[PDB]
Amino acid sequence: YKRCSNGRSVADLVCAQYYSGVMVLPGVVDAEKLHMYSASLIGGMALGGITAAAALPFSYA
Amino acid sequence: PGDFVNVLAIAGLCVNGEIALTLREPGLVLFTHELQTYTATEYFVSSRRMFEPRKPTVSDF
């Protein structure tokens, strides 16, 4: 929204909505956190114990 | 859980190199406290879900 107050470029649809008063807020979780969760779940299959010095061979899980 | 106990798990017993014993139940683990070696002083069975150890029985294998 830093773009939309600086009129040096003509407002596209995302700013025309904002001048009309309606704001889409940042997505509730970013694809960076959603990736860390997915890798937390995949890695959580190789987590055979909290002494996590090397990963458990998946042929044992 | 406030705490975890770290133990070396054994797949089973290869008696005489002839007969292979393993636990009947996938909810139980056969373990020894002696982490740094392939074989150990004494052996126990507990659930994986809570640490409730007992000596192995001929009926578990």
UniProtKB/Swiss-Prot annotation, chain B:
Source superkingdom: Viruses
Subcellular location as annotated: Virion membrane; Host endoplasmic reticulum-Golgi intermediate compartment membrane
Disulfide bonds: none
Function: S1 region attaches the virion to the cell membrane by interacting with host ANPEP/aminopeptidase N, initiating the infection. Binding to the receptor probably induces conformational changes in the S glycoprotein unmasking the fusion peptide of S2 region and activating membranes fusion. S2 region belongs to the class I viral fusion protein. Under the current model, the protein has at least 3 conformational states: pre-fusion native state, pre-hairpin intermediate state, and post-fusion hairpin state.
Assembly mode: Homotrimer. During virus morphogenesis, found in a complex with M and HE proteins. Interacts with host ANPEP.
Record's comment describing the protein's domains: The KxHxx motif seems to function as an ER retrieval signal.
Family: Belongs to the alphacoronaviruses spike protein family.
This protein's name: Spike glycoprotein
Naturally occurring in which organism (per UniProt): Porcine epidemic diarrhea virus (strain CV777) (PEDV)
Origin organism lineage: Viruses, Riboviria, Orthornavirae, Pisuviricota, Pisoniviricetes
Location of this fragment in the whole protein: 1157 to 1217 of 1383
